[PDB]
């Protein structure tokens, strides 16, 4: 059930909310359950395998069970980098932002919870990481 530390180098995480998929993919999450991440990305969607099956689960809803990594540790810099909206979406909440297909913006912080913080026309808010792409520097 629990051997000595060594050949065990997985990313264990613990959930804290009842998330039942969403679309024709992902995986079911029950508060208290642990997931052994197999693959991870920046889109905010994580790939983890459970005692049964694997899939995609929300990192935000997730909560490190003991993973020494404790998820990527970015730095919220007001400097940020310019990003261009690659998807059409309208703000549904005060925190979230509102952008169209091509409405550039200035990121203020990039997190693994998916919904990134984007300041469009001096309006920092929440907008999916994937919903926009990078387009700064040289």
């Amino acid at each position: 059930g629990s051997d000595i530390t060594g050949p065990i180098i997985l990313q264990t995480y613990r959930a804290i909310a009842d998330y039942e998929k969403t679309s024709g993919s992902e995986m079911a999450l029950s508060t208290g359950d642990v997931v052994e991440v197999v693959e991870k990305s920046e889109s905010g969607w994580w790939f983890c395998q459970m005692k049964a099956k694997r899939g995609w689960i929300p990192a935000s809803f997730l909560e490190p069970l003991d993973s020494p990594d404790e998820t990527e540790d970015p730095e919220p810099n007001y400097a940020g980098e310019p990003y261009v909206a690659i998807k059409a979406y309208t703000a549904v909440e005060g925190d979230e932002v509102s952008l169209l297909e091509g409405e550039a913006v200035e990121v203020i912080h990039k997190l693994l919870d998916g919904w990134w913080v984007i300041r469009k026309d001096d309006v920092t808010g929440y907008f999916p990481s994937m919903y926009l792409q990078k387009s700064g520097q040289d």
């Binding site: 969403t22 679309s23 969607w45 935000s60 919870d113």
Partner: peptide, 25 residues
């Protein structure tokens, strides 16, 4: 049938839970 890598869902993950924010701990 390996065609590349594990593609991500077509819909972003739901916002974090209130219990998680109100209580970071």
């Amino acid at each position: 049938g390996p065609l590349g890598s594990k593609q991500p869902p077509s819909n972003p993950p739901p916002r974090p839970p209130a219990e998680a924010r109100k209580k970071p701990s």
